């Protein structure tokens, strides 16, 4: 690119379309699930839904 040799560094990310259960121990939620849902060959980006149990 303009005579300059460019390298696309591979960028990590959380794996999409996969349910995860994490613990926001500082928030009001005991256990929070998530699923960074992203359909393959879809122009729209990912859209994370969270499913979280309240801590009381």
Partner 1 sequence: GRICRPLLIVEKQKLLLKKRHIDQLKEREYNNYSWQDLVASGVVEYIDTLEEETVMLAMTPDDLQEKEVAYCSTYTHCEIHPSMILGVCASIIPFPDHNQSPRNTYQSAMGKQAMGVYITNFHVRMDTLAHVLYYPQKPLVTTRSMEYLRFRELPAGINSIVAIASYTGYNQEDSVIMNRSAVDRGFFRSVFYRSYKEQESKKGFDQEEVFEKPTRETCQGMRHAIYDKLDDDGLIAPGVRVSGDDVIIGKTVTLPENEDRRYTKRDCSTFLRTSETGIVDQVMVTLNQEGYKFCKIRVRSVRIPQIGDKFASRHGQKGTCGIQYRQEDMPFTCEGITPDIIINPHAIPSRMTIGHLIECLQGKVSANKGEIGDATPFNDAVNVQKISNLLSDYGYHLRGNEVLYNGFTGRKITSQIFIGPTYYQRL
Partner 2 sequence: EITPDLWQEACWIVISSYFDEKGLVRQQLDSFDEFIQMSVQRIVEDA
| Residues binding partner 1 (CB under 8 A) | 2, 13, 15
> Does the footprint of partner 2 cover residue 43 (CB under 8 A)?
yes
Closest distance of CB 3 from partner 1, Å: 8
Kindly tell me which of 1 and 8 has the beta carbon lying closer to partner 2. 8
Q: CA–CA distance from 45 to each of 10, 19, 40 (Å)?
A: 18, 17, 10
Find the binder of partner 2 among 10, 11, 13, 28 (CB under 8 A).
10
Place of tokens 């349910």: 19
Q: Which of 35, 28, 36 is nearest to 53 (CA)?
A: 28
């Amino acid at each position: 690119i303009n005579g300059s040799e460019k390298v696309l560094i591979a960028q990590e990310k959380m794996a999409t379309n996969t349910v995860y259960v994490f613990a926001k121990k500082d928030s009001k939620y005991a256990y929070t699930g998530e699923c960074r849902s992203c359909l393959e060959n879809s122009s729209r980006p990912t859209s994370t839904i969270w499913v979280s149990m309240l801590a009381r």
